[PDB]
C-alpha cells in the first residue's frame, strides 16, 4: 500500500504567522487521468475531519485562500499564510489515487508559549485503597511546555515498566501548557515489600531530572 | 441540505456481529457518488474501510484484518457497515462520508467483554511550599464515562482531569487540583465522582496524611 508520512508530528505556531506541513509519499500519486489525488483534511477537537485541499491544489468550498496545497512526485506540502485560532487541530494528508486509500498520521497545529518546567507531585496509596488490597502510586506533572516529556518510575533503585498507566491533557486553552498523569499500579503485598518510590521527569527546562520521592511508612 | 448521521450499538462483546447505519438526508445515494466508511483510533490514525457505488457495487480495503462488508437500502436512503466477529482492536470512531466532502458526526464503538463496574474513588493527599497539589484516583470503572468535580463544581481553577485509560478491561482516571497552602487543609476540598451506568455518585473529602 501507499505509506504517507507527515512532518512534523507537532507544529507550534503563533497566531498571525505562516505555517507549513509536509507529506512524503512512498509512491507517485499520478492517476491514469493525469490528476494527483493528494488531499488535505483538518480535524478540530470533537469533530470529524473536514476537506481543505483536494487533488493537490484545489481549495474546497468555503476554505479561505490562506490555505494552499503544493507538491510533485513524492513530496507534498500544505501552507497556511496567516494562522488563526480556527486553524488549530490535526491536519491529515490523504491519497486516493491507489486503492486502498491511505492517510498520514496527522500533524497537530499548536500554540507557542514560553518554556515551563513541570510541577511534579507524588502520591502514595490512600489508606482506603490499602484497605481494599490495592496500591497505586500517582505522579502529576503539571503545566509544562513544550509538550515533550519523559517520566520514569523507580522502586528501590530499579526502573519499573509494568503497571505504569500514563495519561496526557491536550494543550490548555488559557495558559497553553501541558499536563500529565503517571500511575504505578501494584498489589498491596508487593507495595509493602518495597521502600523507596520515585517519579522522575526529563524535560528540556532542566539538565537534570525533576525527582519526587517517598519512603513507605517514612 | 446534504447530511449524514451514523448510528449503532455503541458497545458490543468480542466475537459478536454488528451493523452501523448511515442515514443520508438531502441527497440520494443512487446519484453519481460513492459512499464511504472510515475509522479513527486513539492516536488519531485514520483508516479507510471501503465504499458502495451509486450503483450498489462495493470496493473494500484489502489490507485490513477486520472482517466486514458494506450494504445499502436505497428506499430508506441508508448505507451500512457490517462488522463481523469483532475484536477489542475494532474499538474507535466510525465515520460515514460521501466522498470526503460531507461527513457525519461519527459513532463511537467499544468492543469489550467487561461488565458494568462502579469505580473505586480514592483521595490523594500530599506526602507526610506556597501551593499544594491534591488529587483523586477514579479506578476500575466500566463503561465510560465518569464525570469528576471538585467542591461540586465550585472549584474549577487549577484543575487537571486526565483522560481515562484501560487497565485490564476497566477504566481508570485521575484529576489534580492545585490551591494555595492557606486554602488547604483549612478549607474543605471534596472530589465528586458520577458514573451513571452503575448509578454511582460518590464524594471523597481529601484529608491530610
Amino acid at each position: 500500500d501507499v505509506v504517507l508520512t507527515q512532518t512534523p508530528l507537532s507544529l507550534p505556531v503563533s497566531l498571525g504567522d505562516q505555517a507549513s506541513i509536509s507529506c512524503r509519499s512512498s509512491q507517485r500519486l499520478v492517476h491514469s487521468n493525469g490528476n494527483i489525488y493528494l488531499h488535505w483534511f483538518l480535524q478540530k477537537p470533537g469533530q470529524s475531519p473536514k476537506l481543505l485541499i483536494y487533488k493537490l491544489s484545489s481549495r474546497f468550498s468555503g476554505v479561505p485562500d490562506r490555505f494552499s496545497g503544493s507538491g510533485s512526485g513524492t513530496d507534498f506540502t500544505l501552507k497556511i499564510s496567516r494562522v488563526e485560532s480556527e486553524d488549530l487541530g490535526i491536519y491529515y494528508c490523504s491519497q486516493t489515487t491507489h486503492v486502498p486509500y491511505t492517510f498520514g498520521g496527522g500533524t497537530k497545529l499548536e500554540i507557542k508559549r514560553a518554556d515551563a518546567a513541570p510541577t511534579v507531585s507524588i502520591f502514595p496509596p490512600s489508606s482506603e485503597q490499602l484497605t481494599s488490597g490495592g496500591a497505586s502510586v500517582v505522579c502529576f506533572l503539571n503545566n509544562f511546555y513544550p509538550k515533550d516529556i519523559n517520566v520514569k518510575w523507580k522502586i528501590d533503585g530499579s526502573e519499573r515498566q509494568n503497571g505504569v498507566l500514563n495519561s496526557w491533557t491536550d494543550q490548555d486553552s488559557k495558559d497553553s501548557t501541558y499536563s500529565m498523569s503517571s500511575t504505578l499500579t501494584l498489589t498491596k503485598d508487593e507495595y509493602e515489600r518495597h521502600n523507596s518510590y520515585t517519579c522522575e521527569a526529563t524535560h528540556k527546562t532542566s539538565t537534570s531530572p525533576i525527582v519526587k520521592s517517598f519512603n513507605r511508612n517514612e | 441540505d446534504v447530511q449524514l448521521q451514523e448510528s449503532g450499538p455503541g458497545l458490543v462483546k468480542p466475537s459478536q456481529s454488528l451493523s452501523l447505519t448511515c442515514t443520508v438526508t438531502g441527497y440520494s445515494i443512487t446519484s453519481n457518488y460513492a459512499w464511504n466508511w472510515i475509522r479513527q483510533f486513539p492516536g488519531n490514525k485514520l483508516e479507510w474501510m471501503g465504499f458502495i457505488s451509486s450503483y450498489g457495487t462495493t470496493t473494500y480495503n484489502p489490507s485490513l484484518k477486520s472482517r466486514f462488508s458494506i450494504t445499502r437500502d436505497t428506499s430508506k436512503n441508508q448505507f451500512f457497515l457490517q462488522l463481523h466477529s469483532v475484536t477489542i482492536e475494532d474499538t474507535g470512531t466510525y465515520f460515514c462520508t460521501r466522498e470526503g466532502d460531507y461527513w457525519g458526526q461519527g459513532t463511537t464503538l467499544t468492543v469489550s467483554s467487561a461488565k458494568t463496574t462502579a469505580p473505586s474513588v480514592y483521595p490523594l493527599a500530599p506526602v507526610c511550599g506556597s501551593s499544594v497539589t491534591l488529587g483523586c484516583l477514579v479506578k476500575g470503572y466500566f463503561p465510560e464515562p465518569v464525570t469528576l468535580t471538585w467542591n461540586s463544581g465550585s472549584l474549577s481553577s487549577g484543575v487537571h482531569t486526565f483522560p481515562a485509560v484501560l487497565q485490564s478491561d476497566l477504566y481508570t482516571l485521575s484529576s489534580s487540583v492545585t490551591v494555595t497552602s492557606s486554602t488547604w487543609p483549612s478549607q474543605s476540598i471534596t472530589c465528586n465522582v458520577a458514573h451513571p451506568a452503575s448509578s454511582t455518585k460518590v464524594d471523597k473529602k481529601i484529608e491530610p496524611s
Binding site: - | 460513492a34 465504499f51 466522498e99
Partner: peptide
C-alpha cells in the same frame, strides 16, 4: 465510474 469525486 465507481468513485465520482475523490473517493
Amino acid at each position: 465510474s465507481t468513485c465520482y469525486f475523490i473517493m
